[PDB]
Amino acid sequence: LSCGQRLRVVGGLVALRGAHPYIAALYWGHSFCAGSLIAPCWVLTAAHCLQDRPAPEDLTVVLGQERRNHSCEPCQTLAVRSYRLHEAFSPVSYQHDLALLRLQEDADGSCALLSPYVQPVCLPSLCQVAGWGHQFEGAEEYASFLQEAQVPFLSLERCSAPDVHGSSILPGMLCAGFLEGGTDACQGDSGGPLVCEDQAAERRLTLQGIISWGSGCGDRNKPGVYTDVAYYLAWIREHTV
Ligand SMILES: O=C(NCc1cccs1)[C@@H]1CN(c2nc3cc(Cl)ccc3o2)CCN1C(=O)[C@@H](CC1CCCCC1)NC1CCCCC1
Numbered sequence: 001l002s003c004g005q006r007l008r009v010v011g012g013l014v015a016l017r018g019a020h021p022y023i024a025a026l027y028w029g030h031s032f033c034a035g036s037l038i039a040p041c042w043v044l045t046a047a048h049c050l051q052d053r054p055a056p057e058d059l060t061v062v063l064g065q066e067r068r069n070h071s072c073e074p075c076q077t078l079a080v081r082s083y084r085l086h087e088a089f090s091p092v093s094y095q096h097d098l099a100l101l102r103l104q105e106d107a108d109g110s111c112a113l114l115s116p117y118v119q120p121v122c123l124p125s126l127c128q129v130a131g132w133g134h135q136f137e138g139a140e141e142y143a144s145f146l147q148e149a150q151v152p153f154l155s156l157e158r159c160s161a162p163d164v165h166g167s168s169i170l171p172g173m174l175c176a177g178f179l180e181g182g183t184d185a186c187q188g189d190s191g192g193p194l195v196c197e198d199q200a201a202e203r204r205l206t207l208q209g210i211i212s213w214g215s216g217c218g219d220r221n222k223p224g225v226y227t228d229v230a231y232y233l234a235w236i237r238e239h240t241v
Pocket residue numbers: 030031032033048049091092093094137185186187188189190211212213214215216217224225
């Protein structure tokens with residue numbers, strides 16, 4: 001497939017190399033974020049990750065990773081040429097929480113080299129959240145292996161009920177997870193993916209959300225909040241020329 005091809009977090013399971021071939025790991029200083037490869041030279045992440053504005057030269061993007069802490073021969077380490085946060089990102093409400101990283105091309109003009117382990121994810125227009133974050137709130141460390149958990153979409157009417165997130169759910173946000181709790185994104189999953197298998201297009205992986213924020217991790221009535229990728233489609237297409 002052109003995109004969304006696949007080879008093979010609280011309450012998740014290990015996701016081995018090739019399970020999420022589009023997932024990007026972003027490193028700088030003592031900081032970390034995840035993202036999604038949406039094209040050979042582009043990675044979609046959360047804007048809140050880069051709000052302190054590190055220099056693009058201080059960032060490292062790693063594609064093909066399984067373990068966050070292992071050096072790996074087929075993994076691709078790329079420099080970041082530049083990045084663009086959404087111009088309307090609000091550090092107070094987290095509305096418009098999205099950012100694009102332009103990867104540094106080599107002499108020939110290539111960035112990510114596609115392989116069974118590195119593939120772009122499809123853009124939108126059976127769901128899972130993935131990341132290397134804390135496996136529970138209060139964990140002293142990030143997960144060593146990538147984790148994956150199945151979560152369903154929750155309607156805006158249910159996510160904005162007063163006992164859930166109320167008036168904090170704004171245009172551009174979506175919720176996924178369970179009101180019972182147990183399975184969710186957590187601290188350290190920032191910028192990572194919420195992908196769904198597209199039944200209309202051969203079950204290809206389609207990026208529906210970007211891990212943005214939550215009240216706790218896996219708490220009752222507090223599901224994870226994500227940036228609605230479909231809502232920002234024209235912005236992403238405009239800024240990825
Ligand atoms: O953890 C976050 N996102 C990932 C998650 C997805 C689902 C659950 S956590 C974000 C961003 N963050 C963050 N810290 C980072 C550290 C690094 Cl190194 C990189 C990105 C980072 O993003 C710290 C605060 N935060 C939050 O979500 C705050 C709430 C926001 C709401 C809007 C206003 C600011 C606070 N609560 C978490 C609940 C779980 C435990 C931590 C607090």
